[PDB]
Amino acid sequence: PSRTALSPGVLSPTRPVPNWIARPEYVGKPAAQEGSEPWVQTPEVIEKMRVAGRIAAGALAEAGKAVAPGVTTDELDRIAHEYLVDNGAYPSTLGYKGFPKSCCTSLNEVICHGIPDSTVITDGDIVNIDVTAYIGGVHGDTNATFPAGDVADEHRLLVDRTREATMRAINTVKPGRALSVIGRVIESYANRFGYNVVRDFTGHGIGTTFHNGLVVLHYDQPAVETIMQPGMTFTIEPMINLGALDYEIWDDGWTVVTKDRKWTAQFEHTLLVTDTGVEILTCL
Ligand SMILES: Nc1nnc(SCc2ccc(Cl)cc2Cl)[nH]1
Ligand code: NI
Ligand code: NI
Secondary structure (H helix, E strand, O other): OOOOOOOOOOOOOOOOOOOOOOOOOOOOOOOOOOOOOOOEOOHHHHHHHHHHHHHHHHHHHHHHHOOOOOOEHHHHHHHHHHHHHHOOOEEOOOOHHHOOOOOEEEEOOEEEOOOOOOOEOOOOOEEEEEEEEEEOOEEEEEEEEEEOOOOOHHHHHHHHHHHHHHHHHHOOOOOOOEOOHHHHHHHHHHHOOOOEEOOOOOEEEOOOOOOOOOEEOOOOOOOOOOEOOOOEEEEEOOEEEOOOOOEEEOOOOOOEEEOOOOOEEEOEEEEEEOOOOEEEOOOO
């Protein structure tokens, strides 16, 4: 038997960031300046994104190494926040549209955007940690779902197959390919097991802004005409559900949960289309 449905807990005090670490423009504003930026990056921006992506991948790995029964999601946040700040990176989530922490921690039926708090992880949970770094004027964005103790087969297989669907999608990226191949491959793979791929949340172009207006669907929609070109930077980040797609948002305005409380898993990397293929920027 696995735990029952989650409820929100209490947040820790806001974690400070030294002032010499530049803030993204949206910190202190109610919305963000994003969605109309070019999709192909310059070489200088790409080089900076490799830095941001490695630092994000570091923070995710350190926080993920900490996932175990008994640890709170706030403890994961303090680990991610300190790794980012000690690397001179601003945690991009902190202050985005008022988001109060430095990463998102999404257990079990939480599709995305969970807020680190007093929630205690327990045996059988699956814990998504999403870490984003802003450094060098650019963002890196990455996430993974980590098992806590012995996870029930249904849930273990959801996590492993979601990781596999993400890697199969990443491996289709190449110049000249329709962007829509990504959601074709993910949805085809998920459909093997009767999983449902989330539609209303998507991958995104990312560069000097976090959601730059490029949208990467994770479901099949071949009418999209966008082609992958060298220098494009964007994420692949499917959320795959055991249950139905219907969801609710908690009163905090962030936490998105499945309406039927069946569990859901996600993995995410920031990618660069190269002249021949793809480079994952959010690798160690
Ligand atoms: N689409 C998406 N990728 N990773 C997330 S975690 C939330 C988040 C992280 C950073 C920033 Cl600047 C904005 C947001 Cl919404 N969401
Ligand atoms: Ni993310
Ligand atoms: Ni993302």
